[PDB]
Symmetry: D3
Subunit: 253 residues, 6 copies
């Protein structure tokens, strides 16, 4: 249940407006299928992600709350693993991803939004991890969050379960930019395009690096960087770029 507008900067819409775009198993799966196609389309250089409706993703899946408390341990684990496969797939995406927080993003969706490379939030949107308020744990989100904000900010958001607003969200480092009420998407598509002008090789790798580093010692990180700094020096894009520079012309990666 997602709509995809292919293009250099592809756009994926969570299609379940009235339900408010719940990250139901079905929805999670549809979102993956897209990312696959989109990852395989050589024309797509970036992917904006947004929601159809008044929100981005925030709507208690009553269909879910009813069952969950009765599923078996083995089924619960099997499911968590699926949902985690989504977050990871997004956070790990090979191409630059940008979340366009048009409306509210609560719990699941809030993490889904955080899992994107960059985030552009509607000046009137809200964001929050409410799991604890009802007995849930924003476990899957925690993974990304410790890397996005300071520890004290993490505790605040996860222990109170409050919803922050665009002004605070940026201040804390949850979102990169705030678009005036109206087109968080337009602005996100803008941001994307810019990032898309840059080298496809350099982008992926930069992302690859930012993944691994946090999980290692200074020296090992430098061992990794050095090696990369090296490899990158034999790539076409570098060749292309350096030429375009010595030809006072735009690079055609």
């Amino acid at each position: 249940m997602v709509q995809v507008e292919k293009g250099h900067v592809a756009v994926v819409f969570l299609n379940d407006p009235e339900r408010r775009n719940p990250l139901s198993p079905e929805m999670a799966l549809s979102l993956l299928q897209a990312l696959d196609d989109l990852e395989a389309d050589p024309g797509v250089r970036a992917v904006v992600l947004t929601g159809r409706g008044k929100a981005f993703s925030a709507g208690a899946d009553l269909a879910f709350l009813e069952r969950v408390t009765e599923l078996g341990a083995e089924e619960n684990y099997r499911h968590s693993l699926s949902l985690m496969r989504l977050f990871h797939r997004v956070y790990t995406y090979p191409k630059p991803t940008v979340a366009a927080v048009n409306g509210p993003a609560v719990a699941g969706g809030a993490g889904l939004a955080l899992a994107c490379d960059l985030v552009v939030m509607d000046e009137e949107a809200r964001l929050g991890y409410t799991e604890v308020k009802i007995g849930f744990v924003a476990a899957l989100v925690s993974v990304i969050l410790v890397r996005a904000v300071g520890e004290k900010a993490a505790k605040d958001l996860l222990l109170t379960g409050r919803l922050v607003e665009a002004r605070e969200a940026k201040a804390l480092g949850l979102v990169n930019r705030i678009a005036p009420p109206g087109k968080a998407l337009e602005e996100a598509k803008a941001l994307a395009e810019e990032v898309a002008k840059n080298a496809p090789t350099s982008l992926r790798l930069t992302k690859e690096l930012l993944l691994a580093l946090p999980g290692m010692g200074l020296e090992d990180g430098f061992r990794l960087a050095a090696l990369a700094n090296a490899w990158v020096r034999e790539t076409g894009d570098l060749a292309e770029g350096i030429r375009a520079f010595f030809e006072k012309r735009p690079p055609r990666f």
Copy 2:
């Protein structure tokens, strides 16, 4: 030397006003004994921590400075281990802790304050790690600090040893909220209560997670999260919460 006002939101006061609440061995021990009782009291859901007097904790223990430079290696290590047992116990506390920085918090106390889950500072209070100014090292604090603020902010605070003020302290991520001159406690007790409304299970675990994650790779962290996300789905609080939701009634965890 601490006073404890039991309650859903318990409050512990560092009782040594005129000396200014020094983290002397004795004081460290009394604080532990409390945390134990309080951790064992099923009525206590949160613990606010503050100081009796003009400060929170900031007062050179001359009794200490005089001895220290003459103790034996084996005694010094034995002591550091005790002080570290305090910081850890606080940072690791099973229940949500909130430091109410009524007055100045310098060196030891500053770390003690930082070791709390959340921090509410008096609009007129000061905070600072002065160890280097005299030859000490805020080693025990460093552990928590790298997780609380950016590296450049860490260096600043630890290399200059300056005292920051409420305005800067929040901006950097050292404190969550600033209470108007007068009741940092009242506001902290407020914050606590809110956090206390949420699920006891979800809270602990959220805390458990935030502890371990920083120390691991993305994938392992996700392995951990998934497993938790799973376990949490068979807990009473979740059952309780989801019910209360389908009964449009307040949850009774």
Copy 3:
């Protein structure tokens, strides 16, 4: 190609004004030689680092761009290792280092600046990691950056390759202070001196600690801290300091 003004607070100038202080192999080497001498000079307690000219360090080394794309894998690796040896040497420096960003710092220089303990930037200066714009990867910088700013801020800067300005640079945690247009150096020398008043022992160790911690679990970090907190208690500077305190006199470390 660097000038060194010895003193308690030494100052190193990148001498290549018109070329704009490129981090060429030669320049990298000269900078090392200085750090060595300066590390060996018992009179030097801190080192400010700045650039001669309109910039700090930002100037495409055309001599480099021309060759690079033709060097051999083995030569590229050999070189990355040299450049990485510089960053590391700076980030690892035993004495407090302070970068005085007088002018623009782009790519290489931007990292060089980030590798310093503290940073004072000219109210009119710019900073940015442009590697991706042309096909390069700010790999070596990534190592330090993940520790300096939030993940979302890292992505922004490295994926867009934009240049930030003094106002944003501080807000994000890239720089500690902003000097009014004119003397970023003067202010940096100021900052340094202050840090230099503090204990030489306590400083080094504080730095040593901040290096290792990020790369380890809470408990191991505490194991490290405890041990340090211990060792530090048998150092002369501590003896000196505690005396000077009981003699209401300035410490002579």
Copy 4:
């Protein structure tokens, strides 16, 4: 190019006898497709893996050696990532895997064999990582090897590139059992079945744990274990097992 004999203990054969079962891109892919089906077949509890022919996997893919040295940086990375996806998929497999080293396993195949949960080697088979002898690096293998053998044993095998024999291979911890010349498979199928008698839940998790632990501090590991030890106590298999025990009957997981 692989044959699959479904069953409680499934068996996959590398089908390329005369070429000697090279881990060519095609072969790598076929092997994945199998693991998927097999992972999805509720009747399959274990998977033995062996080779058709005089070897397990050891045959210079001349088709590969000829091209490789001419591919582009971007193509090389793209490929390494594919091969690494295989190793990982095998090492990460949800079900117990057992490599039946019927014949020689050199380089690629040697790692492929090492990536299995357990290994049964033909009393006359050989194993070795020869990458360095020709200019290659057993990089992908290193990942698993540091966990399989002592550092000094790792260096030996990777620096000399020698081929070890069944007697030494077990002694070092490269293989679990040695079957008399003739049926490494039969014995491997045996080993598998045994492991397959045990709890499907307990097995997966035990594997999950052994993955993550090496990459974390003692305490975090215990945090992980505790949580698991907990979760496992609400699984059907445990219920099933404990019953079967109190009914002096065989467990029907």
Copy 5:
């Protein structure tokens, strides 16, 4: 339910012979109380640990198997945490511990034995982690095991759940020595005494180090070691030892 024979080399006996020394909650607690006293007794330099009866520790706690499958998630976690507190306390013990495996050690006990510094096993004893055979997970043990044996050996033992014998147990690195059928204890007490002749300071620290290292990068580990190597050089025991050496007399630590 444990007996303690104080002495330079203290000995703790698991007292529940006929039940076969099950690691029941009660037993776990009694064992802790001992370790505390013993850790506080300045006369005790080492602690041997063994079992009263035909075994060391191996006896299905039917009282436990009956309940377990019905406890609540929150109770299960609460319990795992208690059992984990035991393993950790043992593995973390400040003084050298030695397990004297007089008889069989299965599951719980097997881990309990592994958690000791050194292990002396009866030439006729058996050891094994059977959790999977019935639906359990040797999670808590995994933590220590990955550090004790090679990965392939870990999988073997945990996936088959088989019981190994003295000959194999040593070969794999599960036990240090094998005593002839009769006095595993006598030999363990012997081993202990020897270790006890050495410096109390040097021992603890050596242990402290072996804990933390596995969980960190080469350089950080060296940062830790260096610091320790340093601290240790100002300890009385070193002073005592070096003297005794220059006085051709036995050291009196």
Copy 6:
């Protein structure tokens, strides 16, 4: 105080026979100077390291024991750092190193020997870490040892301080080969040459990898490997090797 016989396989002799080759500060320095020259000599492909006299390295530096207990904290740290710089330099050496344990190696020397890539020990030699026996801590060695042997083997050796013999040393993984009483060197030079036949590029990198991996999660390690596996595919040695293979001729790296 070391002698160097340049050659494809260089040999360094610890020259202090009668004193028994103590790792005195002076000796440590001379050894470094050699490694530098030797690392810079394009003719040297491997370095064997051995001792002149009845031993490899084992001789209480009485000159040291006398001072040590009186040096200042700051001096002790300064020294540990120097000694650690040696171990690291050896363990980190860019070229393959091989220790030829002609005679006894105790404490310092034992670690020095362990820090080599491979070890060939005299069938009559002994090895042991005796630090604890006198009050010292084999801290610097611990770093390498946890990677060389199982945890239980580490404890044994470091807690008892005993000296093991060639037969046990290999069994545990402390040494790779045992030469018949007479020429541990000859055999080591042999081993070296063999390793030296292989690709200079592949060797270094293999070493680089084995350094970093232990300190990271499975996935990050694979991220590292993949990248390397990639880079290596554009190196001359690979080109050279693959040619020599298609020319049925010996490779001339």
